Design a protein around this ligand. Structure first.
Ligand SMILES: O=C(O)[C@H]1CS[C@@H]2CS[C@@H](CS)N12
Ligand SMILES: O=C(O)[C@H]1CS[C@@H]2CS[C@@H](CS)N12
Ligand SMILES: O=C(O)[C@H]1CS[C@@H]2CS[C@@H](CS)N12
Ligand SMILES: O=C(O)[C@H]1CS[C@@H]2CS[C@@H](CS)N12
Ligand SMILES: [Zn+2]
Ligand SMILES: [Zn+2]
Ligand SMILES: [Zn+2]
Ligand SMILES: [Zn+2]
Ligand SMILES: [Zn+2]
Ligand SMILES: [Zn+2]
Ligand SMILES: [Zn+2]
Ligand SMILES: [Zn+2]
Lengths: 266, 266, 266, 266
């Protein structure tokens, strides 16, 4: 007879796990994650900020890249998140143990983070990671300032209820660069209509397309770089093909409309 | 070049995942887990108690067996744990969502349960499961009474800091049966001496052998049935070869002493 | 010289603390709180629901009234909240310890409840109460069904970020009665404009007036009965003067507009 | 008729709330609390440690004294606790919000801290304070090192289940000074014998007298300075009359034995 199935690990494309050296985006902002998962380090005269960490097994690589940038574990002050799925918040618990970093997130992201991504609205317990506690709860439009760099939260619920875009202004060539780190606008395998766990899912996505379209946005970055047409392995041309926030939102909405139509037809 | 390794799932022997029908231990007490993982259902005129749940994927099987016993989800009042590792507390979060059950545990087990077994003193993040919150914190020697059956906590730290034996008195053939559900006394791959995460590990194990030896114990049961020589697949003879609590403690101590000697020699 | 001030207790009008016997609202719905704080008991063939509990010292009185209604501690299945301030969620922790009740709330209310109302956006640590954990997180528009009575969540952020209206359909004289338990729409001493802890406060209140105006609403009830012109001490005429949801929302908006004007002038 | 009683604030002797300037204990160790509540600042070349904070309203005074010592909010790295009652852990939540500090505590202290001192084994909800989360859980005998100063945990359960002595070695006049910060050994109004919430209370106190007696202890400090005969207002003679750890333990045991006898006679 037949035993219950073994637990299945959350496995991902190899490029999501391929370490890369730090790639500079602007004067204080660096990509320090893997080829296909974004983890942004922002360095200030008063400590560093990390936006996303990628997968759980990326913690040591992140710490190595911070060190290469001159950031010791004590210097990391703040972790911000796009959303609290395993492939973006994965190493947060371990980073908190090994650095001085505290986590700021909205309430939805905080409760999902605290249960390690378990009981996901769409994925059940299939994508769990080590749970972590948020140290600060942020509201929509709230700002957090570190070493004089101001980060603004823009809620864009849909991909998760707590999905957030973070914006800040850096510099390049003596000119301001308004960076928008916009969260995922995908709905991979989601039941969109009449979802009892997320009854206003479609309304939230539509509002979120509008939110992303209107962001202050000289340079768009996304948790999965391919979503904004970044190629982190392409060196000096890594961001050459990057979408505007308007184009990113429009593409996501067109895809979403197609998915809605297929769902009705399914 | 080389990507970071994929996450590895916690996989176990097939017999640990082999469903079995309920096996009666005494008038109110049943084994309802798998062939090689204990999950005890105690049925009272005022609701049911579950002691351990086994692996995370066992939740639905547990609920099926409760139903077979006449226990609806609303009837399950209380979950108790031997210790909060993935193969004994695995389905606790899901059971809480799907039943009326509340969890009672000591502080050490509660904090480990709340982080889903992550940052384990010995296993790091290798054995995580969905986190759950305890509803009641118990102290050593504290009693919990359900439908007139009295459960007593006996702390036996070592295998985990929060390892607990639970004892209660059931009946069989009109005579009282003092049941001892004693936790694991193993230290699988543990650094025993000079462990910076558990400096008093050896003292705690020695105290725990003494605690187990002295338990009220007409019938011994253990989270892994093989540890007390139970054979759940052997029907009417399932408990025939079961160890006494004294014999279980003595065997565990002799094994532990051997492991200490090998560690010194390693 | 001068010692730091003593801690100050959260004290309230005596009528907020004046016990009353259960007052029937509809066939399954009763007011069981105090003269001036609402606590609604909904009794079903499969257990009871409590909506709000009032102040922390009201726990035993609530349990007394449940008993008078035939509801034992084991029979209380679910606690819902308007918002997680001390005068409405006060006894929740104790009720959870003393009954079978589990708490369902949105993420904002859950995180405020979990810190016992401390670090309030407007009141700091002035109104703390015993913290409690939510057992279930609900989304806007989500339904919860108990004994066949269906409760629908309607988020109406403003008074707190997690402020919620709950609606359900009961019966009276063989006819359906659509009950709306709408949260507070007050902003007592709040900084409304340019509040760094709540930057979209005004937008949220405006949306919430519209939400309340549109609720299914044969009978309106509010956490403070005076807000909807209920008089719990007036017996058979207790609800005679009750506002419609439309009138409640309109009055709240007119008051809010006046407060905005005074703030600008202050 | 009669309303339920108003909530009662936890009020204390004025001297417990009387601010004092920093008082040096050894080369890196300062008393920065109030005249009658200990809060120890330990300053290292790599950040500062705070042991206890006193009452909730003491947060700003603590931050003022740290500033006077040259410790900015970012420089405070670690908070340790004797035990998690309101008059020693009171300001911890606020300190975490306003500084870079993370909390390390044992599991018992962590769960009590997380519920803001509510549901106390002896005092119920009479002494609540803002809840805080621990960032690191420590085991008995575990060390924590900051800027080269090594702090060792010594569990001494009784006054609370999580009561802890902290020891470290500082210097004075070129010679090592072994400082013991030993927790309270009082049992104020406690039911000692047959306490269903703390069945092994007497055994734990007896073990704790023995633990305190044996501590490395050139200088004893206690959360209430009077308990070790410190007089913080007495300047150069503040510690002149301080008890040894042996004398402190002996006095506490003699008092405890008297209380046991009175309880039997009561
Ligand atoms: O990649 C995907 O299709 C889905 C399957 S499980 C995981 C959660 S949402 C997305 C990662 S952002 N991902
Ligand atoms: O079975 C074992 O050797 C170890 C490896 S990881 C997991 C945690 S302790 C034991 C299950 S009780 N087990
Ligand atoms: O009644 C009030 O004015 C304020 C002062 S503090 C407390 C929190 S909001 C309202 C109770 S709903 N209340
Ligand atoms: O001071 C006291 O008698 C008691 C009454 S309530 C509070 C908790 S234990 C002690 C403060 S350490 N104290
Ligand atoms: Zn995702
Ligand atoms: Zn992703
Ligand atoms: Zn184990
Ligand atoms: Zn096991
Ligand atoms: Zn309120
Ligand atoms: Zn109120
Ligand atoms: Zn105390
Ligand atoms: Zn004290």
């Amino acid at each position: 007879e037949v035993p219950l199935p073994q637990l299945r690990a959350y496995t991902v494309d190899a490029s999501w796990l391929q370490p890369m050296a730090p790639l500079q985006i602007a004067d204080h902002t660096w990509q320090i994650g893997t080829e296909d998962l974004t983890a942004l380090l922002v360095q200030t005269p008063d400590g560093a900020v990390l936006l996303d960490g990628g997968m759980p097994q990326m913690a040591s690589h992140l710490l190595d890249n911070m060190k290469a940038r001159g950031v010791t574990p004590r210097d990391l002050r703040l972790i911000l998140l796009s959303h609290a799925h395993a492939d973006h918040a994965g190493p947060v618990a371990e980073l908190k143990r090994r650095t001085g970093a505290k986590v700021a997130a909205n309430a939805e992201s905080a409760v999902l983070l605290a249960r390690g991504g378990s009981d996901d609205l769409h994925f059940g317990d299939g994508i769990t990671y080590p749970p972590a506690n948020a140290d600060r709860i942020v509201m929509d439009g709230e700002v957090i300032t570190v070493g004089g760099i101001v980060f603004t939260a823009h809620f864009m619920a849909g991909h998760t209820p707590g999905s957030t875009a973070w914006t800040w202004t850096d510099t390049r060539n003596g000119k301001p660069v308004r960076i928008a780190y916009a969260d995922s606008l995908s709905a991979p395998g989601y039941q969109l209509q009449g979802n009892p766990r997320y009854p206003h899912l479609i309304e939230d996505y539509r509002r979120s397309f509008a939110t992303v379209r209107a962001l202050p946005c000289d340079v768009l970055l996304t948790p999965h770089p391919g979503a904004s047409n970044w190629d982190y392995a392409a060196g000096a041309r890594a961001g050459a093909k990057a979408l505007t926030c308007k184009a990113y939102a429009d593409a996501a909405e067109q895809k979403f409309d197609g998915q809605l139509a297929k769902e009705t037809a399914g």
